[PDB]
Design a protein around this ligand. Structure first.
Ligand SMILES: NC(=O)C1=CN([C@@H]2O[C@H](COP(=O)(O)OP(=O)(O)OC[C@H]3O[C@@H](n4cnc5c(N)ncnc54)[C@H](O)[C@@H]3O)[C@@H](O)[C@H]2O)C=CC1
Length: 405
């Protein structure tokens, strides 16, 4: 009986985390992003050999889809995901990458992936090995890792990032998605150890190590390009992402890229940049209580303006407008910007006006909490059109050309 090896997969939410994922819905969600890109049309003069570090979910997945199905690129992806097994759904990123390989092959595009710790030297060497064997060199490197922790590749020290202000404690309003209550909490200021640890995790060092390992091995093409994704946001989150521990990481990202840019400028006129994207629902969003509230408000306001977007819309524009086109958004430090619709003065004024009016009773009248919840479940393959959620599936979905680290 195949029933022993198959199961009906439903969302299981534990501690603001969805701990299941649906393979059919994840495939459909990837196909929806592919179909957005092909519907919008191809992107000319893009890279044709692309390495995406953090390629399995969110903005890195969107870059992989944009490069492959927008620019026609062969893509090598690096990620850290859990395969499925009987009775135990794997992570959404695993099923997303299975669907990506499936659809890439259908269109005669190369798709190989590496599963393991991208902060390690071992994974960097496996990645170099793949490029040498298959592509020769890569034209473009997307750096799109998000992790709460980094094991230093030389010392073994485990660094943990912190989400805290610097200087004074701050009161941050938020939304508890389990209890569905508006809830303020006070974050204490970060110690210097927390600051240094957060720079080590979310700063630019590992990005630099990647480029330095790749340039040394000759697998970066002439005219190569690399970008790292980040968020800056506006006043509502600024205590954390401007002036807080994470802001220190974005500073160190701004300064480490100067070094990376110098390394690649001497390797035949290459370049390195920081790309700033808009806030989206991601799998970590519910665990940071301010983000569900901010997103629920932002979604409603931007939907009223016709400007609401998610990952694939954002990254397709980044590629078309800035990474490959002639109408870029450079900011004063020399960053590429895709977040300009989120930072519209009137949107921000409206969100900030609503931020102070939302209460437990008008949540659904003042916010798009409905949309937040739907987009959150969608990440894990739940609530997707065309999917029969009553049908058994085998959670052990396999991936060809998956190198396990
Ligand atoms: N979520 C958001 O609202 C925004 C995110 N960003 C940036 O986009 C990038 C991706 O963030 P998200 O899409 O939010 O997160 P995500 O959680 O969707 O994806 C993170 C990626 O990193 C991979 N990863 C994590 N730890 C790894 C490790 N040790 N080794 C290898 N792969 C590992 C995951 O497998 C996945 O591919 C980040 O640089 C983030 O700062 C920028 C603007 C807003």
């Amino acid at each position: 009986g195949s029933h022993m090896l198959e199961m009906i997969i439903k969302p299981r939410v534990r501690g603001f985390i969805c701990v299941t994922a649906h393979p059919t819905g994840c495939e459909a969600n990837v196909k929806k992003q592919i179909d957005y890109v092909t519907t919008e049309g191809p992107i000319a003069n893009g890279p044709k050999r692309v390495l995406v570090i953090g390629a399995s979910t969110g903005y890195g997945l969107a870059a992989r889809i944009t490069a492959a199905f927008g620019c026609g690129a062969d893509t090598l992806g690096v990620f850290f995901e859990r395969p499925g097994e009987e009775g135990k759904p794997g992570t959404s990123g695993w099923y997303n990458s299975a669907a990506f390989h499936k659809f890439a092959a259908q269109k005669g595009l190369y798709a190989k992936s590496i599963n393991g710790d991208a902060f390690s030297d071992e994974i960097k060497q496996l990645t170099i090995d793949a490029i040498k064997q298959d592509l020769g060199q890569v034209d473009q490197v997307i750096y799109s890792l998000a992790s709460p922790r980094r094991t230093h590749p030389k010392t073994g020290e485990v660094f943990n990032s912190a989400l805290k202000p610097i200087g004074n404690a701050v009161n941050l309003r938020g939304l508890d998605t389990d209890k569905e209550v508006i809830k303020e909490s006070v974050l204490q200021p970060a110690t210097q150890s927390e600051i240094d640890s957060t720079v080590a995790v979310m700063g630019g060092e590992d990005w630099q190590m990647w480029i330095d390992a790749l340039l040394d091995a000759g697998v970066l093409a002439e005219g190569a390009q690399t970008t790292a994704f980040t968020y800056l946001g506006e006043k509502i989150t600024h205590d954390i992402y401007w002036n807080g521990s994470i802001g220190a990481a974005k500073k160190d990202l701004d300064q480490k890229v100067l070094a990376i840019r110098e390394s690649l400028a001497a390797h035949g006129g290459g370049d390195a940049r920081v790309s700033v994207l808009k806030a989206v629902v991601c799998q970590a969003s519910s665990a940071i209580p301010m983000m569900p509230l901010y997103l629920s408000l932002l979604f409603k306001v931007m939907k009223e303006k016709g400007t609401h977007e998610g990952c694939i819309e954002q990254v397709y524009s980044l590629y078309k407008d800035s990474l490959c086109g002639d109408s870029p958004h450079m900011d004063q430090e020399g960053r590429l910007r895709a977040d300009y619709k989120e930072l519209d003065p009137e949107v921000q004024n409206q969100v900030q006006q609503l931020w102070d009016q939302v209460t437990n009773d008008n949540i659904y009248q003042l916010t798009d909490f409905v949309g937040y919840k739907s987009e959150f479940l969608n990440l894990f393959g739940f609530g997707i059109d065309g999917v029969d959620y009553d049908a058994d599936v085998n959670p052990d979905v396999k991936i060809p050309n998956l190198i396990q680290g």
